[PDB]
Each structure stands twice: as C-alpha cells, then as structure tokens.
Specification:
Elements lengths: L1 H18 L4 H23 L4 E2 L2 E2 L3 H22 L15 H4 L7 E11 L2 E13 L2 E5 L1 E3 L3 E6 L2 E7 H4 L10 E4 L2 E4 L1
Keywords: Activator, DNA replication, DNA-binding, Early protein, Host nucleus, Phosphoprotein, Repressor, Transcription, Transcription regulation
Subcellular location: Host nucleus
Family: Belongs to the papillomaviridae E2 protein family.
Length: 187
C-alpha cells in the first residue's frame, strides 16, 4: 500500500519536474505532492522501515519540516493563483522555497538582476516583487541606491538589502562601491 502510494506519489513529482511547466497550478501540485511524499515517508519510517527500494528513509523530523514548509508554499501559491498575477508564467524556480527565502523574504518574485557591491558580493534586485496582504496582492518593483536595494509600495521604501549593514560582514570601514550595469553609485 504505502510502498505503492509513495511510488505513485514520487512518480507524479518526477513528471512535474521533467515537465518544467509555466503554469502556477502545476507548481501548486508539486508542493501538494511534496507534502504527500513527506506524509508517506513519515508513515514509512514510522512503520519500522529505513529503506524503501534503494531509497534511504529520512528522519521523522526531516519529513515534519519539509511537510510543514510544503503546506506553507501550497497555501501562498493558491492565494496568488486567484489573481491576475496567477495567469502569468511561473517557473518551478520562481516558486521554490529557497527562492521564497531570498530577500525580500516571504514574497514571490522574478526577473532578478545581479548587482555587485565591492567593499565583493552579489545581490539580487528583483524587477517584479509581489506582496501579500492577507489574501490580497500588489505588484511593485525594485531600485538600487547608495544605502542598498529596495522596493516601493506607495511613498514608502522597504530595503531588503542594506549595503551598510552588509558592509560590516566584510570591510572594517564604512566605504563600499555599488556597480549596476556600467553604472556605479558610491557611499
């Protein structure tokens, strides 16, 4: 049963991955399957197993976490999908959990251009950032300046990269240089 369900499940995941869909509804499914695989693998190591076929069963916590994150990504995507933004192209990467944890944290986004800061380090400037207020969504854009990278929602700016702060993790000075496509802004 379980060995079969997990099998059916991991199969659907594989097809999704190899499919490289641009429709957000498919990625909601990926996350839905990731949850099932984590539920099942949880049940699997619960029943005594430690190996299924040639696959190593992971720790009970490992699955708890992954299952937990999946439901988060699952719910946020479903909300977004109800909007005009949901009809846009959404890659498996645009919807990854790692991506979701890239500044600005907990916001979907795409078209991230690379900015370089010499104290060097690279940071991403998102062309499109979608903010979630309850179940409502807004689409804003980013900009770069001497203090850092930020997006704008009204008259207020929100920095998600603080060149200053970022300057402590490196040089002893308060001097840094920002290079953005042949353009250079300096302290």
């Amino acid at each position: 049963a379980i060995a079969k369900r997990l099998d059916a499940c991991q199969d659907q995941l594989l097809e999704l991955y190899e499919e490289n869909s641009i429709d957000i509804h498919k990625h909601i499914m990926h996350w839905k399957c990731i949850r099932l695989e984590s539920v099942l693998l949880h049940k699997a190591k619960q029943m005594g197993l430690s190996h299924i076929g040639l696959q190593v069963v992971p720790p009970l916590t490992v699955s708890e976490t992954k299952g937990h994150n999946a439901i988060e990504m699952q719910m946020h995507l479903e909300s977004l999908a109800k909007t005009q933004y949901g009809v846009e192209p959404w890659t498996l990467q645009d919807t990854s959990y790692e991506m979701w944890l890239t500044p600005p944290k907990r916001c979907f986004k795409k078209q991230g251009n690379t900015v370089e800061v010499k104290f060097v380090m690279e940071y991403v400037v998102w062309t499109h950032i979608y903010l979630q207020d309850n179940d409502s969504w807004v689409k804003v854009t980013s900009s770069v300046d001497a203090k850092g990278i930020y997006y704008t929602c009204g008259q207020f700016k929100t920095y998600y990269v603080n060149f200053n702060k970022e300057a402590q993790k490196y040089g002893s000075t308060n001097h840094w240089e920002v290079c953005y496509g042949s353009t250079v802004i300096c302290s």
